[PDB]
Design a protein around this ligand. Sequence first.
Ligand SMILES: N#Cc1ccc2c(Oc3ccccc3OCCn3ccc(=O)[nH]c3=O)cc(F)cc2c1
Ligand SMILES: [Mg+2]
Lengths: 409, 546
Amino acid sequence: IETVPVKLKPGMDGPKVKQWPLTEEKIKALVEICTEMEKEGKISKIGPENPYNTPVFAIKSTKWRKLVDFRELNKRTQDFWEVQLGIPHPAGLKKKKSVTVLDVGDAYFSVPLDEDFRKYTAFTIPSINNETPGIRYQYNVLPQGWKGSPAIFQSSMTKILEPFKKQNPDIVIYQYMDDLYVGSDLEIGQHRTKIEELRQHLLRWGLTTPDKYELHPDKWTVQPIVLPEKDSWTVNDIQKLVGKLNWASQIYPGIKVRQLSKLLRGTKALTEVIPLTEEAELELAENREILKEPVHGVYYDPSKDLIAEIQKQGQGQWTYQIYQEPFKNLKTGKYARMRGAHTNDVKQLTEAVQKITTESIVIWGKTPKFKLPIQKETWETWWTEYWQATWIPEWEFVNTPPLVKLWYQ
Amino acid sequence: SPIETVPVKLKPGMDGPKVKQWPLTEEKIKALVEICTEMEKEGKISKIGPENPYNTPVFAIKTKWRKLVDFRELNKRTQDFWEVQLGIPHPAGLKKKKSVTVLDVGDAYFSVPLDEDFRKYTAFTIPSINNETPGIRYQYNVLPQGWKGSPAIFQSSMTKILEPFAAQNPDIVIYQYMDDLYVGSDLEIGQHRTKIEELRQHLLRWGLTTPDKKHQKEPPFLWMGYELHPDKWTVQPIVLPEKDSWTVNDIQKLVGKLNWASQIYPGIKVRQLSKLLRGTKALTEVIPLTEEAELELAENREILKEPVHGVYYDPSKDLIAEIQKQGQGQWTYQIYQEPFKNLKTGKYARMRGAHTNDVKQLTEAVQKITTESIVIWGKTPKFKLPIQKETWETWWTEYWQATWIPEWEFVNTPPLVKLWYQLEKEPIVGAETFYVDGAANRETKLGKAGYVTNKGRQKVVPLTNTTNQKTELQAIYLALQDSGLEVNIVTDSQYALGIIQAQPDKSESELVNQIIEQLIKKEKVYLAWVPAHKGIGGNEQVDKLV
Ligand SMILES: N#Cc1ccc2c(Oc3ccccc3OCCn3ccc(=O)[nH]c3=O)cc(F)cc2c1
Ligand SMILES: [Mg+2]
């Protein structure tokens, strides 16, 4: 129980983010949670001479967990705690036939946090209507959601995990903050029995885990674009097809389209049918054959953090692309799930963001900055209502994505 | 005096203020030594023998001179603190109490001791006898006025002095605010007066004077621009000046007063009055008021002639909020719990989106009100809105953004929020197909707009003082004018397709308004797009024409 010293990157002050207004119910859950944590020693009240603040939220399955937004403290510490105490990211985790996630954040709560550092973990429980300045805490142990907590604990973690790895060399185990990804090529029943084996092994060494949720990164990554396959095509369908191929041509080098363009030689009515030429099928079938291949020369770049764009499609579907440079996608996909009595645009969007962030963690070990299609203040109000991860991606709110909505589905 | 001090650092690397004293006039020096011997006898300051390198200047000003101590160079150097309570309670969020009193804490900052190790950094000096003799050297033992740390250290010191009293009196409500305590209770009068004297004695035991019941402020309370009444609240009376001429300064002050009043007086409008400020920010630039602006101002005076009041919150009752449209993208709303009284009122405006839509603006207003409800009461209102279920459902299903729509019910008070037209999702069989294009010269600023149809019609129209995007909107306006009630249109412009596929009800550009009229009139309009300069057919001929 000798604290690891923690130093900030040079010339860098502590975080000073504003704390969001919260409803009375969520303030009461935060007050109960913190009243308990204070008498367990995990946190303590602080005075006016501590200026830093970090946002706090309450989320839910039928009881309230607290959720701290350490994004700003993470930018000002962990970026010098990746160069110093960084966690290597395996490239095999993206390939395993199954991957289960295990929450192991409880392990941080025994370990003391460095005495000189605690000031920077300060947070505020708001009062309603500014009746009081908020209740004002700082952490005395490693906080969940801080990216220094896993880095400090990783020696203890690799020690506790080592005998299980020696027993099962072919399992992959990677740690991103509070979560442990474990991947195997086992049959799903063998995979889940091995997961329960790891849960029992973690319990014998004093690590509780909540459960009493699997990924399949054999994902068919970055799906090819599909042209419509109608039995008979009107001027309108050919115009939409030619425009879609023309947008593709700035991504795929070899698209040809001239014998589809001459196919609308006259100033035709939009609904007039046109037969396809023996020459025009040379455009359609060959553009399909060239559209069914991966783009050449697209590689992940460690020096540049990933970007993820989303487009609502209607009917509960959402298209997304993870990319680092424009028109050079590293992954694309489609989220889709709905229940009419239990689904709306923000629930679908938050679930999609969590799913994309999980894919991004399994694939590259870091998270994308989202370009979310939603009013800013709407999202800032309601995103916590369906949030479930302990981590939070960066995000911003983007103006209209026009007409590409058809071009990505 | 016995209060525990808050430890205080200097900023890292930085060291304490060493500042040469300015010369002081003869009448002021003795007037300062006079205040200083009394401050010392009270223990607020203490003399020092100059082993202390630091100094800051001391001014005087005035039947009783006061002393001033510039502290910028020290405040530059001391550590940051917890930010001192930005914002204030909203009276709509207070709950009624049978008794309310207001205690001014006197000498507030000088009653709370300064941290010991830091006191040496507050040294100051009084010149003596035209700098012919060394002056006195005092230093503070308590929070200086104007010190960067005084307000937040006093706040937390006060909150700690109140702890035993709140512990012993769970039912009494105390609000802190700077020098003031606001105490409310549901005790019968006399029991409340006894508790006020108890709290006053407890405060004096910690060295904090408070007004005697002969000097405690009487209701209604004039606080932060409100009149706080025992059973109602309102804003302090608004005065709108009548001027023969108006500067940007005057329009700023007027827009501010009108916005302030809008929290309780319903229906105040600010659009035209604030459009005057859209130009250059030179504060003295006199601007003529416009016709619509003075109409708006008179319509505001009409509402301000009659006084209006708000009620306080009752947690047992439901929280209802209702929204009404006004002209040019203005919306007003009332938050209320009872049929004839409001908790508060307010407005919303589209705030410089180039083209907007009634359902989008109504949704943004519901968003603004949801954020206000969470801030002021910690919950969100039930909504009563002038829109039908099918209208909003259709809009939020077509719309490209995600959107949260809370529980709400229809209120059939016109004007109603409606969808004024809908583009067809698929091309119109049997309807004429216009291919349109428009082009312009960026230097000469003249252009052409035209169309070519499958029926064989063609037309071209000259344009002066236009831009290459404005011409492509003009070409669509042309096709709408020259077609029957069902028309297909094929444009080569991404910009025009974005402006029109958003389905706006309104725009600050007159040409888009003229298009919106034609879209409401036409029975069906399919709008399609193709890349320019690709020889598509139709678009090729139209591009050749222009
Ligand atoms: N000067 C002054 C000032 C005075 C009082 C303030 C204030 O009283 C309260 C303190 C504790 C609980 C409720 C309170 O107010 C409820 C509304 N209210 C007001 C006056 C009255 O006569 N009756 C009544 O119901 C609260 C506050 F937020 C600021 C106050 C400021
Ligand atoms: Mg054009």
